[PDB]
Structures are given as structure tokens and as C-alpha cells.
Paper text:
We identified 30 molecules of nine distinct nucleoporins in each IR subunit, including four copies of Nup93, six copies of Nup155, four copies of channel nucleoporin hetero-trimer (CNT, each comprising Nup62/Nup58/Nup54),13 and two copies each for Nup205, Nup188, NDC1, and ALADIN. The central scaffold associates with four CNTs on the side of the central pore of the NPC. The elongated α-helical domains of Nup155-2 and Nup155-3 interact with each other in a roughly head-to-tail fashion, creating a homo-dimer of ~290 Å in length. Notably, however, the spatial gap between these potentially interacting helices from S1 and S2 is large enough to disallow direct interactions. This analysis suggests a weak interface between neighboring IR subunits, which is consistent with the observed contraction and dilation of the NPC pore. However, the symmetric IR subunit is placed on the NE asymmetrically, tilting toward the cytoplasmic side by ~10°.
A vertebrate NPC consists of four circular scaffolds: a cytoplasmic ring (CR), an inner ring (IR), a nuclear ring (NR), and a luminal ring (LR). IR resides in the central layer of the NPC and bridges the outer rings CR and NR. In this study, we report the cryo-EM reconstruction of the IR subunit of the X. laevis NPC at an average resolution of 4.2 Å, with local resolution reaching 3.8 Å.
Residue numbers in the entry:
A (entry chain I): 282 to 350
B (entry chain G): 156 to 187, 319 to 402
C (entry chain H): 359 to 398
């Protein structure tokens, strides 16, 4: 029976060790991923603000060119 | 004895040998013709059948190919990749924001010159 | 037969948890890709 009672312990050892990897995944929970979408949604609106500023600049540029001419 | 056999099922259950891997068999879509070269001739030990079913259920097949996920240690490595990608991601957002801010400052200066 | 019971029990439990964990990892990866697109 020693074989059986050693196989039981080694088997439960392997299983518990894999449960440890389950525990590691449990620790690994990710949230900066949730932050990435916010960062990108903000980068878009900021680039849009810059675009609006430059688009306001272009009309002044045309006015400057024509008036200087 | 069915006791030792149930124990063998428990032993192959929670394990890295993919012997009915503890119902921990789970597939992730890792972004990726060489696709059709890799996605067939199946992977490191995943069953051809479930791998084909995964390539069948994989969303964004052009934006992602199937990748074996091996237990929860692989989930851990995946979350590590996730955190690293998130770091580079907010860093790239930072680069874009710096570009936008420089644009706005120089545009303000240009506009002020326009008035002169 | 007691420890044999706890073996299968912990198996099923931690397996359900780890499956949900791989699922959360998949979701985080989906969000990472989707935000990378906007970054591009």
C-alpha cells in the first residue's frame, strides 16, 4: 500500500502546486489596462484641441498673406 | 480501486501535462500568409480539435491569432505582458500628448505674431 | 477517502477561479489592443 499512499501524496502535491499557479494568476489582476482606454480617449481630444488651434491659425495665415500682398 | 483512479484524475487534473488540464484549458487571442503557416500544424501540445475550434471561435482573426494558454501560470505571464504593454501604452499616449502640447504652445505664439 | 475529496474539490474550485482569471487576462488584452489602435 506504501506505493498507493505515496502516489496519493505526490499527486495531491502536484495538484496543490498547480493551485499555487491559480493563486498567482489571482494575484496578477490588471487595471492599468483599464487606464489605457482613458489615456487614449484623452489623447484624442487633446490632439483635437491642437487641431482646432491650428485650424484657427490657418485662416489668420491666409488673411496675413492676402493683406501683405 | 476507483479511489486511486479518481486520485489519478485529480493528479492529471491540476497539472502542466495537459491531461485534461483541470478544466483549466483556456485559449487567448494573441495578436498576429505566415499566419496560415503557424495557426495550422497545431501548437506545443494543444489538441488539434480544440485548437481548430478556437481558431473557429477566435474574435478578430486578422487582429489576433490563437495562442495556447497553459493553466493559470500562463494567465500570470499574460497579465505581466498586459502590464508591460500598458506601461508602453501610457508612455506612447504621453509622447502624443507632448506633441499636442508643443503644437498648441507654438500655435499660440504664431497667432500672437499674427496680431502684430 | 477524505483527502481524496478535498483534492477534487480544490481542483474544481481553483479551476473555476483560474478560468475566470484567464478570462480577465483576455479582456485586458482586448482593451490593450483596442487602445493601441487609437494611439496609432
Amino acid at each position: 500500500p506504501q506505493l498507493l499512499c505515496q502516489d496519493v501524496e505526490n499527486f495531491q502535491k502536484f495538484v496543490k502546486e498547480q493551485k499555487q499557479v491559480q493563486e498567482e494568476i489571482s494575484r496578477m489582476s490588471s487595471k492599468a489596462m483599464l487606464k489605457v482606454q482613458e489615456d487614449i480617449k484623452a489623447l484624442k481630444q487633446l490632439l483635437s484641441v491642437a487641431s482646432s488651434g491650428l485650424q484657427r491659425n490657418a485662416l489668420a495665415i491666409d488673411k496675413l498673406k492676402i493683406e501683405t500682398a | 480501486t476507483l479511489l486511486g483512479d479518481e486520485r489519478d484524475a485529480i493528479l492529471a487534473k491540476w497539472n502542466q501535462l495537459q491531461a485534461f488540464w483541470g478544466t483549466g484549458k483556456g485559449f487567448f487571442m494573441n495578436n498576429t500568409v505566415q499566419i496560415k503557416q503557424l495557426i495550422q500544424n497545431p501548437l506545443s501540445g494543444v489538441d488539434p480539435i480544440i485548437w481548430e475550434q478556437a481558431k473557429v471561435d477566435n474574435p478578430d482573426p486578422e487582429r489576433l491569432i490563437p495562442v495556447p494558454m497553459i493553466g493559470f501560470k500562463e494567465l500570470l505571464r499574460r497579465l505581466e505582458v498586459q502590464d508591460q504593454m500598458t506601461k508602453q501604452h501610457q508612455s506612447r499616449l504621453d509622447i502624443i500628448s507632448e506633441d499636442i502640447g508643443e503644437l498648441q504652445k507654438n500655435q499660440t505664439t504664431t497667432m500672437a505674431k499674427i496680431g502684430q | 477517502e477524505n483527502l481524496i475529496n478535498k483534492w477534487s474539490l480544490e481542483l474544481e474550485d481553483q479551476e473555476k477561479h483560474f478560468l475566470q482569471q484567464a478570462t480577465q487576462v483576455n479582456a485586458w488584452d482586448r482593451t490593450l489592443m483596442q487602445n493601441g489602435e487609437r494611439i496609432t
